[PDB]
Structure 1
Amino acid sequence: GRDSLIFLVDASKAMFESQSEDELTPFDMSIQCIQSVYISKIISSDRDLLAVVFYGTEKDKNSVNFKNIYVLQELDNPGAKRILELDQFKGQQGQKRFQDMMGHGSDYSLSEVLWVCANLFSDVQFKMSHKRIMLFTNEDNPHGNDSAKASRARTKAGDLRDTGIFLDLMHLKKPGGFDISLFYRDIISVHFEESSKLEDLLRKVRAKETRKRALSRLKLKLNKDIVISVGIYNLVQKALKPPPIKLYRETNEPVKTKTRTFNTSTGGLLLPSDTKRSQIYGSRQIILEKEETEELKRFDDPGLMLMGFKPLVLLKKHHYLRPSLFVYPEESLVIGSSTLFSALLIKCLEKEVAALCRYTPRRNIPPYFVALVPQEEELDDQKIQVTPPGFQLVFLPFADDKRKMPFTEKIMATPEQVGKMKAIVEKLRFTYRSDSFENPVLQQHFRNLEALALDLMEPEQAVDLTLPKVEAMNKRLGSLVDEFKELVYPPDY
């Protein structure tokens, strides 16, 4: 449920060495990779557990008590001085000191290493799912000498994949990024792409957050006589942080502050009995029970009702407000809405018609009128899903929505502009994407925490464009905005 993800560096010998190359030991590149995912799960803050281990080496860290290994850490959600604790390992001083202080390279034996790290899959005491491992190697030859080691590769390998446990080798630059194809299968283990490097890892997880989540499950009675139960889902919440946590000063420790009510006149206490929930205006104070309030919500019950069918195009935006998060109607428990819900969306979409509902949130609420667009089902060859089949949970518009908005005259433009304006926008347009879109200015703080995480000087201080780039603005389009400026006006801004 909260799963496994694993760092590993191969060792024969020369790997922790740089191949005498003048940039880095690709070993070290791997080092910052480890840094990058383990750090990454600071941001993503993933109850997935992470692994740091090496092998193939001089001394050992393990419980399996064999040559050419080191544990680094056991499976973990991260730690600040788990980060720091591993932070020694950059730098040639830290290359070496890391190496020798631990000892660096002698021999190894492959599938031995398999059940090594696998036997870090032993380390699981908890609920995990994903078994995912990464070897760091340029190794062209595991060995030529004992091909019984090779049979051991092709032997235990299939076991460990069959173990559901999956390690691959990303294209880490042995020359050509690798030149080897040949025997390599064993070494390695909703439409997307793949990459050979860490940078993708780096930025991709710079802002990243939770993955496996579906929890509170409501229903929809369609009519009074027929059934569906409805899965509540958050495509997101407009995801925010785990928020500021109380820890006292020098003690550093959680306050375990509590709250109740003393009497605020006499030194006595107060109790929910002793108080109530009031509205007050003018002269009259008026007091009614926290109960009385919470059940004044009551109309029906948490649950949902097909309230009808509407033109989809009937409302585009005259309007908009707090989103649908996405309810997928459950079909395992209640199926046939497999079929029902299926052809529902089929034809209602065909009708450009939608199923209105009155949604009743959890432990009641006052419920509300909200449309449900049938959500279509979009999948390509490898099945990118932009539209998981379902409903758009479409809030209806209401008085408050319209509580105010002005109306007055409008003076209008001319085609003389649009002739240029269009292509002007063609310079201002970009094909956009699903991706690289956020409010990082909050991200920057879990950068600021990446600090104490590594305990270093300045953050990653990475780059997303949520802000426009001038060279392109003044580049592709140019100053034709001048033409527009003096079209109808000498502005002085």
Structure 2
Amino acid sequence: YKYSGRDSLIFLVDASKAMFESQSEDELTPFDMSIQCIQSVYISKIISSDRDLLAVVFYGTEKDKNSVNFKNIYVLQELDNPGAKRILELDQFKGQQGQKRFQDMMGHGSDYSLSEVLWVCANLFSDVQFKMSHKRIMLFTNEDNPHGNDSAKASRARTKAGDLRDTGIFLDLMHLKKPGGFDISLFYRDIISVHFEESSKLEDLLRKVRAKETRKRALSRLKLKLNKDIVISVGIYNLVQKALKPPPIKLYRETNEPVKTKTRTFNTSTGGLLLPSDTKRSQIYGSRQIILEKEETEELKRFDDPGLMLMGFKPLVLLKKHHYLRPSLFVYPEESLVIGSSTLFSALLIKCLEKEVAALCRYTPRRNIPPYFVALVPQEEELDDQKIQVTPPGFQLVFLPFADDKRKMPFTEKIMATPEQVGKMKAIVEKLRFTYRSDSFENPVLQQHFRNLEALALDLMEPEQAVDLTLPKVEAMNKRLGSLVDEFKELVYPPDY
């Protein structure tokens, strides 16, 4: 879908006693399972996408809250952006005492009707003003025949859920270990888009996974001036960009209210609230003072207008991988401007890969920025993983240093090791061989930070303290490697350290 549309998601639990207070074991509880799910996807969505909408609803309860079509349904929460007080409302109903806390309020086991329940949720999504990209309902019921004993009750539901799917709201399901069996082919076969224990999907809602997730958006758009005249529009996209702990919002102590940092500039002698025109900019050199205006400290540092000018072609081997400037950015075509320029770009991509070549360019991302120099290395897609595109096809902008960047480094000379000293090393290295994958690690600080932040947010008992994956697991490095550190200590240097 288009950029702005929120994900929006409504959670809809069976309040019926026959599942709600029920267990075959003692070790879980289907309502305590669903409520855990709702709290846990919701705490995922809080860290990861505060912009996307959640609601939660109980059907078949005995005391009601709805706009209309009231009987035996209670909207615990209408659609809203997610936060702490909503997670505290769900927390109240959890656990062995929780399954009594709920009973003092909304009441349990009464008759219900899916064609009314699906009506209610529909009205909910309608009532909200925002643009929605995905509209999804989640069923937390075990009741595999949903009391369609009256087939002329049940045909209402099936038609109404035809009407859900027809209006482009989706609906989705989880089965919840009903004693002895559950089978979708009896009923729910036509409500969703051979026999089950409990859903292999449901564990994915307990991943508790944390990052920002920020959708595909351009960094900027530019014209690749091949010369004085021929241009194509290309996008500039950010495939790799270091995340930061979110900017902290300064607060008033006594009320927790936000407060305005309200900076001014004041003459050291006198009451002049000096305006931006009152003051210049300056330097000191050679015991004299150089004076420039607030226009020209940024008229200096201009050279060009926003574009990419072609500088001719190179071998890919001469672009030496030791000197690297800043993270590489992707280039991909954009018919939003310069229509049909995709036809040129695609031929340019295809044929550079045959030539074993890069294009060299001068790059300005904005007006009032100096040109850097950038090699456009061409790119090719590994769809072989059943069209999981690990690599999009296009170009990489790889940046190149200038003289000033390549800092001087001290004198040293040696070519010291013998073939035995390499030969022992060639063993330890081959014993320590694993497979790195790009996603195999996580930031120890930024992951810890969210766990501290949750403890403070919910008033939990404890910070979760989940230990990081960057420390070497040194006992495994002792054992897999084995004792071979002694080959350095014996064969390579004296015993004095």
Q: Same fold (TM over 0.5)?
A: yes
For residues 94-127 of structure 1, the C-alpha deviation after alignment (integer angstroms, 9 at most, x for no partner) is 2320244222331221232223223221132112
CA contact (8 A) 1:172 1:197 kept: no
With over 3 angstroms needed to count, the CA separation of the structure-2 counterparts of 1:366 and 1:53, relative to structure 1, is same
> Are 1:2 and 2:6 an aligned pair?
yes
2:76 counterpart residue number: 72
How many residue pairs get aligned? The number is: 493
For residues 390-447 of structure 1, the C-alpha deviation after alignment (integer angstroms, 9 at most, x for no partner) is 2211111222331233452244444545555456445433323343533131232222
Selected match of 2:453 from 445, 449, 453: 449
Structure 1 range deviating more: 322-331 or 208-217: 208-217
With over 3 angstroms needed to count, the CA separation of the structure-2 counterparts of 1:381 and 1:488, relative to structure 1, is closer
With over 3 angstroms needed to count, the CA separation of the structure-2 counterparts of 1:395 and 1:258, relative to structure 1, is same
Q: CA–CA distance in 2 between the matches of 1:431 and 1:215? A: 32
With over 3 angstroms needed to count, the CA separation of the structure-2 counterparts of 1:27 and 1:313, relative to structure 1, is farther
CA contact (8 A) 2:302 2:367 kept: no
Q: CA–CA distance in 1 between the matches of 2:173 and 2:489? A: 56
CA contact (8 A) 1:170 1:196 kept: no
Q: CA–CA distance in 1 between the matches of 2:376 and 2:495? A: 47
For residues 210-232 of structure 1, the C-alpha deviation after alignment (integer angstroms, 9 at most, x for no partner) is 23533533332233222212222
With over 3 angstroms needed to count, the CA separation of the structure-2 counterparts of 1:376 and 1:407, relative to structure 1, is farther
> 1:183: how far off?
4.6
> 1:25: how far off?
0.9
Secondary structure of the corresponding residue to residue 465 of structure 2: coil
CA contact (8 A) 1:81 1:453 kept: no
With over 3 angstroms needed to count, the CA separation of the structure-2 counterparts of 1:60 and 1:339, relative to structure 1, is same
> 1:378: how far off?
3.4
Structure 1 range deviating more: 166-175 or 369-378: 166-175
Q: CA–CA distance in 2 between the matches of 1:103 and 1:238? A: 50
> 1:63: how far off?
1.7
> 1:22: how far off?
0.6
Structure 1 range deviating more: 253-262 or 281-290: 281-290
Structure 1 range deviating more: 243-252 or 414-423: 414-423
CA contact (8 A) 1:191 1:383 kept: no
> 1:130: how far off?
1.6
CA contact (8 A) 1:43 1:209 kept: no
With over 3 angstroms needed to count, the CA separation of the structure-2 counterparts of 1:89 and 1:192, relative to structure 1, is closer
> 1:197: how far off?
4.8
Q: CA–CA distance in 1 between the matches of 2:489 and 2:199? A: 45
CA contact (8 A) 2:315 2:358 kept: yes
> 1:251: how far off?
2.6
Secondary structure of the corresponding residue to residue 160 of structure 1: helix
Q: CA–CA distance in 1 between the matches of 2:257 and 2:493? A: 63
2:230 counterpart residue number: 226
For residues 224-269 of structure 1, the C-alpha deviation after alignment (integer angstroms, 9 at most, x for no partner) is 2222122222224312233111222113111122123122332321
CA contact (8 A) 1:229 1:329 kept: yes
Q: CA–CA distance in 1 between the matches of 2:153 and 2:468? A: 47
> 1:44: how far off?
0.9
CA contact (8 A) 2:431 2:481 kept: yes
Structure 1 range deviating more: 243-252 or 210-219: 210-219
2:96 counterpart residue number: 92
Structure 1 range deviating more: 159-168 or 176-185: 176-185
With over 3 angstroms needed to count, the CA separation of the structure-2 counterparts of 1:461 and 1:103, relative to structure 1, is farther
Q: CA–CA distance in 2 between the matches of 1:171 and 1:311? A: 58
With over 3 angstroms needed to count, the CA separation of the structure-2 counterparts of 1:185 and 1:244, relative to structure 1, is same
For residues 377-397 of structure 1, the C-alpha deviation after alignment (integer angstroms, 9 at most, x for no partner) is 332464222222222111112
With over 3 angstroms needed to count, the CA separation of the structure-2 counterparts of 1:362 and 1:57, relative to structure 1, is same
Structure 1 range deviating more: 11-20 or 235-244: 11-20
CA contact (8 A) 1:371 1:395 kept: yes
CA contact (8 A) 2:63 2:106 kept: yes
Structure 1 range deviating more: 158-167 or 385-394: 158-167
> 1:193: how far off?
20
Structure 1 range deviating more: 454-463 or 337-346: 454-463
> 1:146: how far off?
1.9
> 1:19: how far off?
2.5
Q: TM-score, normalised by structure 1?
A: 0.89
CA contact (8 A) 1:42 1:450 kept: no
Structure 1 range deviating more: 308-317 or 30-39: 308-317
With over 3 angstroms needed to count, the CA separation of the structure-2 counterparts of 1:119 and 1:267, relative to structure 1, is same
- Percent identity for Structure 1 against Structure 2: 100
Q: Which has the higher contact order (CA 8 A, sep 6+)?
A: 1
> 1:320: how far off?
1.5
CA contact (8 A) 2:308 2:361 kept: yes
Selected match of 1:383 from 361, 384, 387: 387
> 1:360: how far off?
0.8
With over 3 angstroms needed to count, the CA separation of the structure-2 counterparts of 1:290 and 1:141, relative to structure 1, is same
CA contact (8 A) 2:12 2:138 kept: yes
CA contact (8 A) 1:43 1:205 kept: no
Q: CA–CA distance in 1 between the matches of 2:93 and 2:181? A: 24
For residues 54-103 of structure 1, the C-alpha deviation after alignment (integer angstroms, 9 at most, x for no partner) is 21222223222422322122222222222223321222112320244222
Selected match of 1:298 from 287, 299, 302: 302
CA contact (8 A) 2:240 2:328 kept: no
Secondary structure of the corresponding residue to residue 424 of structure 2: helix
Q: CA–CA distance in 2 between the matches of 1:56 and 1:191? A: 26
With over 3 angstroms needed to count, the CA separation of the structure-2 counterparts of 1:276 and 1:143, relative to structure 1, is same
Q: CA–CA distance in 1 between the matches of 2:31 and 2:440? A: 29
> 1:134: how far off?
1.9
Q: CA–CA distance in 2 between the matches of 1:295 and 1:347? A: 40
Q: Which has the larger radius of gyration?
A: 2
Secondary structure of the corresponding residue to residue 89 of structure 1: coil
> 1:301: how far off?
0.8
Selected match of 2:174 from 170, 176, 189: 170
Q: Give the unaligned 5+ runs of structure 1.
A: none
Q: CA–CA distance in 2 between the matches of 1:341 and 1:190? A: 49
CA contact (8 A) 2:8 2:135 kept: yes
CA contact (8 A) 2:181 2:196 kept: no
With over 3 angstroms needed to count, the CA separation of the structure-2 counterparts of 1:106 and 1:407, relative to structure 1, is farther
CA contact (8 A) 2:8 2:54 kept: yes
Q: Give the unaligned 5+ runs of structure 2.
A: none
Q: CA–CA distance in 1 between the matches of 2:188 and 2:434? A: 41
Structure 1 range deviating more: 176-185 or 448-457: 176-185
With over 3 angstroms needed to count, the CA separation of the structure-2 counterparts of 1:370 and 1:350, relative to structure 1, is same
With over 3 angstroms needed to count, the CA separation of the structure-2 counterparts of 1:323 and 1:125, relative to structure 1, is same
